[PDB]
């Protein structure tokens, strides 16, 4: 395949190319070229910070404790993974992204506190 | 609350707003503006590198194996967490920061080596 080769593939199939996409995020006139590189770095770091905040700091794929709400475009399970591409999915739930992210942050802080308490039990 | 809303709160109470603060670290004339952004990125990375070095790479809160020395401003336990703010605490132990950081780095390298040996036991 190669970079974005999986863009037209189903969401399930495309889950096998996350490595490929991840590597291509990093790999006066001149000042505007320099500005663009700096902004690209800041963007990269923001995505990494969210993964860190959500408790998914070193994974391309991870699980969380936030249940999927049926209100968030319930489109079955197999229909999403086998008969839809990621480009379509990103529109199906575009109005829920901020809700989901907020939930992911909250159901991390709750976990860190529980872990901290357990480490204090002699 | 919001960004720095917890600054006047006790250290204990303020531990619940770490997420808020973390997100606001990332979120010729023009060249000096560009320079400032670059330096902000380097600062951010230095803090992340220390967390990585200390074995606390993806957590807002983590525990270590370094004991607290009573010489490091022993101010009880409940007094620190309930009747002090983080701004005050940062002055109470400002002369011990480098000592603590050095200890945190050493009591990581010792742990990585022990883990490495255990993974070689058939």
């Amino acid at each position, epitope marked *: 395949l190669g970079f974005l080769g999986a863009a037209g593939s189903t969401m399930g199939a495309a889950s096998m190319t996350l490595t490929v996409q991840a590597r291509n995020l990093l790999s006066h006139w001149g000042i505007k070229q320099l500005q663009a590189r700096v902004l690209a770095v800041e963007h990269y770091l923001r995505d990494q910070q969210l993964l860190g905040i959500w408790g998914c700091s070193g994974k391309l794929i991870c699980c969380t404790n936030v249940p999927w709400n049926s209100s968030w475009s319930n489109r079955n399970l197999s229909e999403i993974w086998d008969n839809m591409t990621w480009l379509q999915w990103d529109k199906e739930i575009s109005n829920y992204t901020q809700i989901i992210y907020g939930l992911l942050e909250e159901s991390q802080n709750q976990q860190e506190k529980n872990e*901290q308490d357990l480490l204090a*039990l*002699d | 609350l919001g960004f720095l809303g917890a600054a006047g709160s006790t250290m204990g109470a303020a*531990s619940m707003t770490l997420t808020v603060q973390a997100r606001n670290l990332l979120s010729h004339w023009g060249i000096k503006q560009l320079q400032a952004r670059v330096l902000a990125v380097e600062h951010y990375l230095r803090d992340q590198q220390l967390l990585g070095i200390w074995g606390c790479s993806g957590k807002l809160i983590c525990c270590t194996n370094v004991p607290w020395n009573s010489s490091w401003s022993n101010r009880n*336990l409940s007094e620190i967490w309930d009747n002090m703010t983080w701004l005050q605490w940062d002055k109470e132990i400002s002369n011990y920061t480098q000592i603590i950081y050095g200890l945190l780095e050493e009591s990581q390298n010792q742990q990585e080596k022990n883990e490495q040996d255990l993974l070689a036991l058939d």
Partner: antibody
Amino acid sequence: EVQLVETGGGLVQPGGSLKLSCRASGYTFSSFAMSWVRQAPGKGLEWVSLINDRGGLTFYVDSVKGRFTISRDNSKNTLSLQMHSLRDGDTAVYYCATGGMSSALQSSKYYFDFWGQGALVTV
Amino acid sequence: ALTQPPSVSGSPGQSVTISCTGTSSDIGSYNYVSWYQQHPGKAPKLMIYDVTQRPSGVSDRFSGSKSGNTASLTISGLQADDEADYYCSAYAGRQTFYIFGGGTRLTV
């Protein structure tokens, strides 16, 4: 004045269920871990369950592990215990108590400071 | 369970000792052994915690100690008002959390 006041209880058939509750005041409810302690008629004291102050961590004695639920509502200042699949061996006074584990920032206790008077449960 | 054997007694004004024997790892490793005063039909009162501490509201009469795998409660000069069952309990390593001892009766 710290008070823990239990309610609920009564006689239930073996194989049945019931729920106990405890209201509390005189202290910040949300600042303390709580537990239920069993006083069987002639045994005096048995630990049953422990819940932390945020209501997220629960621990049980093995004998009730698959049957009892310990829960909290910090807006109501209420502790509660749901007991399922009751046995005759569970006949006891069940006491509401504050203590046990703590927040890890505040001098963990590992003992009980306050007791209610307890609900009587017969099975 | 921990064992506090029956029974302990003495005349008013005499000191008495109430024992509590554990096993190996429970009260041997954890300095979280408490004592309670249990009245016949009332909720128990905390007397001793950790090893040697007592809460406000508890008089000087009650003190205690631990050695090896055995703990004890000492009453420095017994009152008739102390006719209660005594119970010891201790932290159990996050496995069983707390172990209560069989209690023992004090007669004055």
